[PDB]
Structure formats: C-alpha cells, structure tokens
Amino acid sequence: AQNPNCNIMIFHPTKEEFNDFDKYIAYMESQGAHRAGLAKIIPPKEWKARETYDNISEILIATPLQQVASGRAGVFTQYHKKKKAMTVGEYRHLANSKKYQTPPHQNFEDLERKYWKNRIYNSPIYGADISGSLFDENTKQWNLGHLGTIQDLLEKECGVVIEGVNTPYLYFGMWKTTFAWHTEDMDLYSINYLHLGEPKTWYVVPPEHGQRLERLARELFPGSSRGCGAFLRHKVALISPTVLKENGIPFNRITQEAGEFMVTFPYGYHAGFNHGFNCAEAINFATPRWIDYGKMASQCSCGEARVTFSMDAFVRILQPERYDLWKRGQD
Numbered sequence: 326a327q328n329p330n331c332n333i334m335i336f337h338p339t340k341e342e343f344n345d346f347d348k349y350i351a352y353m354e355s356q357g358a359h360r361a362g363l364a365k366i367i368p369p370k371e372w373k374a375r376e377t378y379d380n381i382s383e384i385l386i387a388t389p390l391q392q393v394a395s396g397r398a399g400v401f402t403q404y405h406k407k408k409k410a411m412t413v414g415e416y417r418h419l420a421n422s423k424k425y426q427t428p429p430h431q432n433f434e435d436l437e438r439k440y441w442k443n444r445i446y447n448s449p450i451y452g453a454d455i456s457g458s459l460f461d462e463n464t465k466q467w468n469l470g471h472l473g474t475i476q477d478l479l480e481k482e483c484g485v486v487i488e489g490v491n492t493p494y495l496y497f498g499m500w501k502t503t504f505a506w507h508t509e510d511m512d513l514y515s516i517n518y519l520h521l522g523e524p525k526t527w528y529v530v531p532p533e534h535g536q537r538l539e540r541l542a543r544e545l546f547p548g549s550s551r552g553c554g555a556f557l558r559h560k561v562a563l564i565s566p567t568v569l570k571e572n573g574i575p576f577n578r579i580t581q582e583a584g585e586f587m588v589t590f591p592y593g594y595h596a597g598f599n600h601g602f603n604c605a606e607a608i609n610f611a612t613p614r615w616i617d618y619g620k621m622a623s624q625c626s627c628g629e630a631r632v633t634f635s636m637d638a639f640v641r642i643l644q645p646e647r648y649d650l651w652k653r654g655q656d
C-alpha cells in the first residue's frame with residue numbers, strides 16, 4: 326500500500342502533466358496521496374491563474390462574518406455574526422489595521438503558537454462563500470471555473486441525469502480567520518487555490534481515521550452531539566493540535582502559500598487558519614472513487630447545516646432512505 330503512514334504529499338507537475346486534471350488526480354492517488362486527506366500541488370513555473378491582481382478591490386463582500394469564539398483556547402466553538410457589506414478594498418484596509426493585523430513573529434511555527442494561544446480573545450472578520458472566480462478565462466489548466474461538474478460525474482458513473490450546478494467560491498481572509506473541523510458536503514473532494522496574500526495553515530485527519538476525530542468531538546462538545554448526530558456539519562468546532570495529540574488522534578499539518586493548490590479527499594476532516602490578508606478560491610469535485618463515500622456520508626437533519634440546492638439531488642439519488650428526513654431538516 327502506498328503512503329501507509331498517511332503523510333501529506335507535495336506534487337510538482339510539469340506543464341505537460343498539468344493538462345489533464347482528472348488524470349493527475351488519479352496519479353496522485355496511485356502514489357497514496359488520498360490516504361492523508363490533503364495534498365499540495367505546486368503549479369508548473371510557466372503557469373499563472375491570471376495576469377495581475379491589480380483590479381479586484383471592487384468585488385463586494387455582501388455579508389462579512391465576524392467569527393466570535395466561546396470555550397477554551399484549545400477547544401472552542403465559533404459563531405458567525407453578520408456585518409455590513411464592504412468591498413475587497415475596504416476589507417483589505419481593515420485586515421491591515423492595527424486591531425486586526427498579523428503580529429510580529431519569527432516564522433510560521435511561532436505564528437501557529439500565537440494563533441492557538443490567543444485566537445479565542447479576538448473576533449476576526451471573514452468574507453466567505455462568495456460565488457465567483459478569479460481565474461482568467463484564458464487559463465486552460467486547473468481553472469477552477471472550468472472543471473467537469475459533479476452532476477456530470479454522477480451521470481457518467483451511474484447513468485442518472487440530475488439537476489444542479491457546481492460553481493466556485495471566493496474567500497477573503499485576515500489574521501486568525503478560522504475554518505472549523507469538517508468534511509465536504511456529501512464527503513466530496515475540494516480543491517483550493519490561494520490566489521494572493523498571506524498563507525493558510527491546514528490540519529487534516531486521514532480518512533481512514535475520521536471516526537476517531539468524531540468520537541473525540543462527541544466527548545468535547547457533548548451538548549452539540551446530543552442535538553445532532555452529525556454536528557461537525559455545522560462547521561463551528563475547533564480542536565487544537567495539542568488537544569488532538571493528548572487524545573491520540575492521528576493528524577498532519579501543512580502551510581499553503583500564495584500560488585499553491587490544495588486538494589482535500591473524500592472524508593478527510595480538515596480545519597485551519599489564515600496568517601493575514603489573503604484571497605482563496607475553492608470548489609468541490611468528484612471522481613469515480615468518491616461515489617461510495619457519497620453513499621455513506623453523514624448528514625445533519627437538525628436543520629442547522631442548511632446547504633445548496635445541488636446537494637438535494639445527491640442525497641435523493643445516493644441516499645434515498647435518508648432523503649425524507651434530510652429534506653425535513655432543509656425545509
């Protein structure tokens with residue numbers, strides 16, 4: 326078996342290898358990459374997402390989210406308070422203000438120490454889940470607005486035509502903005518490109534060990550667990566690397582820099598934080614190997630997780646027994 330310790334793998338495709346997206350994903354999996362839950366892909370040196378980022382300031386963040394924490398430094402939840410609309414130029418100025426800017430630090434490890442010590446004492450503002458793309462239409466390779474759709478994959482593998490669409494989303498971050506422990510909707514893959522700015526640190530649990538993370542989360546968030554049988558779908562819970570180590574949970578970490586892609590694999594729990602002002606683009610995708618994960622994915626039926634129009638069809642076709650109860654949650 327390849328990559329039996331489930332380490333995060335880093336790939337450096339040539340421009341020739343960067344032509345065929347599906348083929349490269351299948352290659353990475355042939356080397357065991359999926360066992361980690363997360364891989365990094367450094368694009369060929371000749372490739373670019375677009376010519377410049379000079380003209381993005383007028384993108385609107387219609388509903389910036391203030392991420393307010395509760396709990397202890399290593400075990401906390403966050404709630405998202407809605408704020409008034411602002412442009413990306415206005416958000417960048419806010420991220421760079423004395424109140425929100427990255428503190429002085431020695432290196433990424435020192436900054437990670439400072440994040441886990443101090444995150445709960447601040448409420449950074451995140452622009453999340455903004456439908457759109459920053460890839461130039463002329464970028465033909467690994468353009469996250471031009472991928473094969475999940476509805477087309479399901480149709481190709483299973484023969485069933487379904488409604489729904491698959492588009493990318495933009496993320497504008499600042500120091501301490503946080504993504505909670507989660508897998509993707511329907512345990513899909515994700516791909517994330519860091520277009521510009523400061524890094525993003527990721528933590529990930531190997532898919533084969535995801536249930537260990539779930540059992541710890543039920544112990545650490547016991548009222549949330551009683552409220553919902555898949556409460557990590559709410560995307561609110563954080564657990565630090567120190568707490569994971571104290572409880573024997575297998576995980577890995579890596580820092581993504583501007584210009585780099587990350588891929589998350591089916592049922593790879595992940596969480597992380599931004600180092601300073603940045604912009605990322607991400608989308609879900611599927612492969613043939615995903616189908617069985619989609620059939621087994623947990624679902625939130627308490628009604629908190631509330632997700633896209635296109636997830637309906639996935640549940641209806643892959644999980645017809647759950648359909649009924651999951652849609653009672655979504656209506």
Ligand SMILES: O=C(O)CNC(=O)C(=O)O
Binds near residue numbers: 504517525608
């Ligand atoms: O970058 C972010 O805030 C969160 N993104 C992801 O969870 C992803 O790409 O799967």
Ligand SMILES: [Mg+2]
Binds near residue numbers: 380381383
């Ligand atoms: Mg603009």
Ligand code: NI
Binds near residue numbers: 507509515589595
């Ligand atoms: Ni994700």
Ligand SMILES: [Zn+2]
Binds near residue numbers: 559627
């Ligand atoms: Zn729920």
